Amino acid sequence: GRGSEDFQYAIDMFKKFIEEAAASMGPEAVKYAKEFLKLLKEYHKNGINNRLLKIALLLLRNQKKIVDKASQDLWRRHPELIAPGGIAFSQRDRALCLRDYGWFLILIVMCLVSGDKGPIEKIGLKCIREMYNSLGVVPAMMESIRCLKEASLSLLDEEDANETAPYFDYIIKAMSLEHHHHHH
Numbered sequence: 126g127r128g129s130e131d132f133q134y135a136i137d138m139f140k141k142f143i144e145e146a147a148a149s150m151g152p153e154a155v156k157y158a159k160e161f162l163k164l165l166k167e168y169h170k171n172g173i174n175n176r177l178l179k180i181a182l183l184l185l186r187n188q189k190k191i192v193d194k195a196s197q198d199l200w201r202r203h204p205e206l207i208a209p210g211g212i213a214f215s216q217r218d219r220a221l222c223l224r225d226y227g228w229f230l231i232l233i234v235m236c237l238v239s240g241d242k243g244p245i246e247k248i249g250l251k252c253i254r255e256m257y258n259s260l261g262v263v264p265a266m267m268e269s270i271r272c273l274k275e276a277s278l279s280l281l282d283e284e285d286a287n288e289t290a291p292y293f294d295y296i297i298k299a300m301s302l303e304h305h306h307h308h309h
């Protein structure tokens with residue numbers, strides 16, 4: 126692991142995310158993410174919003190801490206996820222939970238630096254549909270992003286949390302509609 130307070134750190138975090146998730150999000154989404162990365166660098170040439178980059182870095186350096194804290198909260202509130210017959214019982218499946226947890230955070234950070242829910246509309250909404258095609262309707266999943274939200278916002282002040290909270294709310298609402306309107 127490695128943390129940094131530079132713009133190159135956030136760029137590298139997005140690059141590694143594009144590489145790791147390319148096969149999962151599909152080709153239309155990696156094109157969106159590649160264009161996003163090119164545009165953020167172009168506008169960085171004209172000066173970046175320091176408050177947004179500060180919140181973005183703070184969540185990025187503590188990504189694994191947030192992932193571990195949220196996953197621990199989720200297993201406690203819903204032990205059926207890791208129990209036999211659960212979706213995260215298998216060590217590979219549980220590792221995939223933590224992977225998507227860190228991926229969900231990257232999407233949150235992509236919205237922070239841009240101040241727009243665009244990356245969650247394009248990449249997030251499509252991946253939630255594909256994630257439910259492979260998993261199915263598991264009611265404990267609704268508490269997933271809540272644990273991620275509570276674990277991320279606990280590292281921010283009230284002003285920074287108010288800036289980040291809408292993107293978590295947007296994902297939870299989207300998961301809610303995908304959850305209860307999937308087989309319809």
Ligand SMILES: C=CC1=C(C)C(Cc2[nH]c(Cc3[nH]c(CC4=NC(=O)C(C)=C4CC)c(C)c3CCC(=O)O)c(CCC(=O)O)c2C)=NC1=O
Nearest residue numbers: 146149150212213218221222225228229252255256259269
């Ligand atoms: C851009 C960020 C991106 C995001 C957030 C995603 C979600 C996503 N997960 C999965 C698969 C996926 N997820 C999980 C677990 C999980 N995810 C959670 O958020 C929580 C919580 C849990 C644990 C309870 C498992 C076990 C599997 C494999 C299931 C199977 O193959 O049969 C797919 C289908 C394609 C694939 O296999 O990768 C997609 C689209 N894909 C991106 O690229």
